[PDB]
Design an enzyme around this catalytic site. Structure first.
Site, PDB file in Angstrom:
ATOM      1  N   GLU A 128      -3.839  13.426   1.873  1.00  0.00           N
ATOM      2  CA  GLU A 128      -5.092  12.928   2.423  1.00  0.00           C
ATOM      3  C   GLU A 128      -5.888  14.084   2.973  1.00  0.00           C
ATOM      4  O   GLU A 128      -7.007  14.380   2.535  1.00  0.00           O
ATOM      5  CB  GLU A 128      -4.822  11.807   3.438  1.00  0.00           C
ATOM      6  CG  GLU A 128      -4.250  10.597   2.754  1.00  0.00           C
ATOM      7  CD  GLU A 128      -4.416   9.332   3.488  1.00  0.00           C
ATOM      8  OE1 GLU A 128      -4.148   9.325   4.714  1.00  0.00           O
ATOM      9  OE2 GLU A 128      -4.821   8.350   2.843  1.00  0.00           O
TER      10      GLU A 128
ATOM     11  N   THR B 105      -6.480   6.187   8.377  1.00  0.00           N
ATOM     12  CA  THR B 105      -6.943   6.445   7.002  1.00  0.00           C
ATOM     13  C   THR B 105      -6.844   5.216   6.076  1.00  0.00           C
ATOM     14  O   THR B 105      -7.164   5.355   4.900  1.00  0.00           O
ATOM     15  CB  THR B 105      -6.221   7.639   6.380  1.00  0.00           C
ATOM     16  OG1 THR B 105      -4.855   7.290   6.191  1.00  0.00           O
ATOM     17  CG2 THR B 105      -6.408   8.904   7.182  1.00  0.00           C
ATOM     18  N   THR B 106      -6.394   4.107   6.622  1.00  0.00           N
ATOM     19  CA  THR B 106      -6.432   2.812   5.940  1.00  0.00           C
ATOM     20  C   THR B 106      -7.230   1.893   6.823  1.00  0.00           C
ATOM     21  O   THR B 106      -7.271   1.998   8.039  1.00  0.00           O
ATOM     22  CB  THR B 106      -5.018   2.261   5.705  1.00  0.00           C
ATOM     23  OG1 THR B 106      -4.368   2.101   6.947  1.00  0.00           O
ATOM     24  CG2 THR B 106      -4.249   3.063   4.759  1.00  0.00           C
TER      25      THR B 106
ATOM     26  N   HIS C 239       0.889  -1.201   0.000  1.00  0.00           N
ATOM     27  CA  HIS C 239       0.000   0.000   0.000  1.00  0.00           C
ATOM     28  C   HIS C 239       0.902   1.219   0.000  1.00  0.00           C
ATOM     29  O   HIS C 239       0.609   2.140  -0.831  1.00  0.00           O
ATOM     30  CB  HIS C 239      -0.877  -0.082   1.273  1.00  0.00           C
ATOM     31  CG  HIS C 239      -1.744  -1.344   1.307  1.00  0.00           C
ATOM     32  ND1 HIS C 239      -1.750  -2.279   2.325  1.00  0.00           N
ATOM     33  CD2 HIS C 239      -2.666  -1.740   0.427  1.00  0.00           C
ATOM     34  CE1 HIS C 239      -2.635  -3.235   2.009  1.00  0.00           C
ATOM     35  NE2 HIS C 239      -3.242  -2.874   0.885  1.00  0.00           N
TER      36      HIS C 239
ATOM     37  N   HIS D 178       1.669   9.128   1.931  1.00  0.00           N
ATOM     38  CA  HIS D 178       0.708   8.975   0.882  1.00  0.00           C
ATOM     39  C   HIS D 178       1.090   9.960  -0.204  1.00  0.00           C
ATOM     40  O   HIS D 178       1.530  11.077   0.078  1.00  0.00           O
ATOM     41  CB  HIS D 178      -0.718   9.285   1.393  1.00  0.00           C
ATOM     42  CG  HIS D 178      -1.121   8.461   2.567  1.00  0.00           C
ATOM     43  ND1 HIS D 178      -1.818   7.294   2.420  1.00  0.00           N
ATOM     44  CD2 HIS D 178      -0.874   8.596   3.875  1.00  0.00           C
ATOM     45  CE1 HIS D 178      -2.016   6.771   3.583  1.00  0.00           C
ATOM     46  NE2 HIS D 178      -1.466   7.521   4.478  1.00  0.00           N
TER      47      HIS D 178
ATOM     48  N   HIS E 176       2.841  10.776   7.639  1.00  0.00           N
ATOM     49  CA  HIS E 176       2.197  10.462   8.878  1.00  0.00           C
ATOM     50  C   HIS E 176       3.189   9.825   9.822  1.00  0.00           C
ATOM     51  O   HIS E 176       3.745   8.771   9.517  1.00  0.00           O
ATOM     52  CB  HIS E 176       1.037   9.434   8.634  1.00  0.00           C
ATOM     53  CG  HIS E 176      -0.095  10.059   7.937  1.00  0.00           C
ATOM     54  ND1 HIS E 176      -1.132   9.321   7.348  1.00  0.00           N
ATOM     55  CD2 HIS E 176      -0.368  11.365   7.704  1.00  0.00           C
ATOM     56  CE1 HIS E 176      -1.953  10.124   6.792  1.00  0.00           C
ATOM     57  NE2 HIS E 176      -1.557  11.387   6.969  1.00  0.00           N
TER      58      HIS E 176
ATOM     59  N   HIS F  66       4.959   6.744   7.562  1.00  0.00           N
ATOM     60  CA  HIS F  66       4.722   6.398   6.189  1.00  0.00           C
ATOM     61  C   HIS F  66       4.161   7.592   5.479  1.00  0.00           C
ATOM     62  O   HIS F  66       3.817   8.601   6.108  1.00  0.00           O
ATOM     63  CB  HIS F  66       3.768   5.265   6.070  1.00  0.00           C
ATOM     64  CG  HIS F  66       2.428   5.567   6.695  1.00  0.00           C
ATOM     65  ND1 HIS F  66       2.085   5.339   7.988  1.00  0.00           N
ATOM     66  CD2 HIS F  66       1.352   6.144   6.162  1.00  0.00           C
ATOM     67  CE1 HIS F  66       0.888   5.812   8.253  1.00  0.00           C
ATOM     68  NE2 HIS F  66       0.415   6.245   7.126  1.00  0.00           N
TER      69      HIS F  66
END
Length: 257
Positions: A103, A195-196, A61, A93, A116, A91
């Site tokens: 996000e 958020t996942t 991901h 995004h 994040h 991690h």
């Protein structure tokens, strides 16, 4: 299983994870004109001097930089928080193009990426217990814009070649997360979620106002990662962001005037 595609992406997640339509989902749009300054908020305390990174992982991901969280080494305190939160991982995004990737959004503006830094509340003893609690996690969110290179990112960029595909990890010791922080610690805060999947509603979000700059070359190396495993058809790891969710009965608070 879940991902970011047409058939398995964010609009589908609610079938396996019904909290996706919950009351405190993340991310959200931060409307800067309606976030109120809260004089009762404290400065954030970020104490990363003894952080001990261990490893970087492609989980299919994103990639995760993992820390030894077996002592109070790297902790977040203050701000909106009560008590002490230990760094476990960070991690990112990011997008397929520089106009998308974050996000959270700020007055509907999307940044090229978002970092994040995930921390768990020491009063619950481990991460798995913490995510079961409404105040279990504190996530520091940091926007990335494309401009000048971020020297403190390059060690991360450097290693991505070795973790191209899902399930690959590499030693990643001695990485100092202080080099990913902007100059100011001014922030917005609100209660939300991961958020996942599993989308648990356990997070106090702390979103910094000031973005960091990274170079086009740095971002371009994130976009060469793969969501697939070795020897499977290549599908570039891009657009691994969840869009903004309804704010519902929440207030965003600002630490700054």
């Amino acid at each position: 299983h879940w991902g970011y595609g047409k058939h398995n992406g964010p609009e589908h997640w609610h079938k396996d994870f019904p909290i996706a339509k919950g009351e405190r989902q993340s991310p959200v749009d931060i409307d800067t004109h309606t976030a109120k300054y809260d004089p009762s908020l404290k400065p954030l305390s970020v104490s990363y001097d003894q952080a001990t990174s261990l490893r970087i992982l492609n989980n299919g991901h994103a990639f995760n930089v993992e820390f030894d969280d077996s002592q109070d080494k790297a902790v977040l305190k203050g701000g909106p928080l009560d008590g002490t939160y230990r760094l476990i991982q960070f991690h990112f995004h990011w997008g397929s193009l520089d106009g998308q990737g974050s996000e959270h959004t700020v007055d509907k503006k999307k940044y090229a990426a978002e970092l994040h830094l995930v921390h768990w509340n020491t009063k619950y003893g481990d991460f798995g217990k913490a995510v079961q609690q409404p105040d279990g996690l504190a996530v520091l969110g940091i926007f990335l814009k494309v401009g000048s290179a971020k020297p403190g990112l390059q060690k991360v960029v450097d290693v991505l070649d070795s973790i191209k595909t899902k399930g690959k990890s590499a030693d990643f010791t001695n990485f100092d997360p202080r080099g990913l922080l902007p100059e100011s610690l001014d922030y917005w805060t609100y209660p939300g979620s991961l958020t996942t999947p599993p989308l648990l509603e356990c997070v106090t979000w702390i979103v910094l106002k000031e973005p960091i700059s990274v170079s086009s070359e740095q971002v371009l190396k994130f976009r060469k990662l793969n969501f697939n495993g070795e020897g499977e058809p290549e599908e570039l790891m891009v657009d691994n962001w969840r869009p903004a969710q309804p704010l519902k009965n929440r207030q965003i608070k600002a630490s700054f005037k």
